[PDB]
Symmetry: C4
Subunit: 56 residues, 4 copies
């Protein structure tokens, strides 16, 4: 059959998987947030290149 | 193979599959983020020349 | 009922999930630490625009 | 029998996830080094001012 302790173990696996999934959704959105650094860093690089055009 | 156990196992399978795919998405986003190292290194270099 | 070897397999599965959960917590805090880069990068941008008004 | 096969596939999937996790942590540790670097850049921008 479906033994009670096996059942219990399965429930805890369910809980843990569910925690893992939601943590992954946090991970992903933090990453989406961090990826915005690429353009910003690119802008700094661009500004530093206009700045280095300082024939003074 | 109890039907309910069976159902539970399939649900675990779905969750694992989803987790795995999220992992590949995370890795790729990370591979992209890693390109920042060279860019930041480059800015540092430009800033030192600028000095 | 709950067969000995299935039982052994379930415990190993439990061990792996625990480890995975843990690595996730460490991953999350590393990410929270990296997110501070946003403000810092923003400051740099600002202090460089300030510099550009060098004329 | 079929449950056995399912458990093996779960074990496979778990191992893969775990290993991606080690690759993720390592990429992250490398990314963490960016903290000192932009701190330096920040410092050299202040000195430039």
């Amino acid at each position: 059959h479906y033994d009670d302790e096996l059942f219990s173990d399965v429930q805890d696996i369910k809980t843990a998987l569910a925690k893992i999934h939601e943590d992954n959704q946090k991970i992903i959105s933090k990453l989406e947030s961090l990826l915005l650094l690429k353009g910003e860093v690119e802008s700094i690089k661009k500004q530093i290149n206009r700045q280095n055009i300082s024939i003074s």
